[PDB]
Write a protein that binds this ligand. Structure first.
Ligand SMILES: [Cl-]
Ligand SMILES: [Cl-]
Ligand code: NA
Length: 129
């Protein structure tokens, strides 16, 4: 599923991301835009052989099991394919564990480089929430 901007904002608010660990909703929408272009089916292979999955590009070296990242962890206890569903619940629940691990949203390189320090409220401007 390719989400619209305000559609995704509303889904993320419903799932408890607005102000989660202090990050306003626009931060999460901005991260999803630059990580996946709002596409739940996005995948990208990394140099070390791990793969990133879904609307928030969650990495198989630490967070999910894809059966092909030797020596990796599965800290969200899910198959990585669950992160590609049109229902974003699994992605959001895993993202909450990632953002709570001490590094905050700096875990998402696109957030650090394209959202951090910008006017992120612009990402939810005009939406009915
Ligand atoms: Cl915001
Ligand atoms: Cl933080
Ligand atoms: Na893994």
């Amino acid at each position: 599923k390719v989400f619209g901007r305000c559609e995704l904002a509303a889904a993320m608010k419903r799932h408890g991301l607005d102000n989660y660990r202090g990050y306003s909703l626009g931060n999460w929408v901005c991260a999803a835009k630059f990580e996946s272009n709002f596409n739940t089916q996005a995948t990208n292979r990394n140099t070390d052989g791990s793969t990133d999955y879904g609307i928030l590009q969650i990495n198989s070296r630490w967070w999910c099991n894809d059966g092909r990242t030797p020596g990796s962890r599965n800290l969200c206890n899910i198959p990585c394919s669950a992160l590609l569903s049109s229902d974003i619940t699994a992605s959001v629940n895993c993202a909450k564990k990632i953002v709570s691990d001490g590094n905050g949203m700096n875990a998402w390189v696109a957030w650090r480089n394209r959202c951090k320090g910008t006017d992120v409220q612009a990402w939810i401007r005009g939406c009915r929430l």
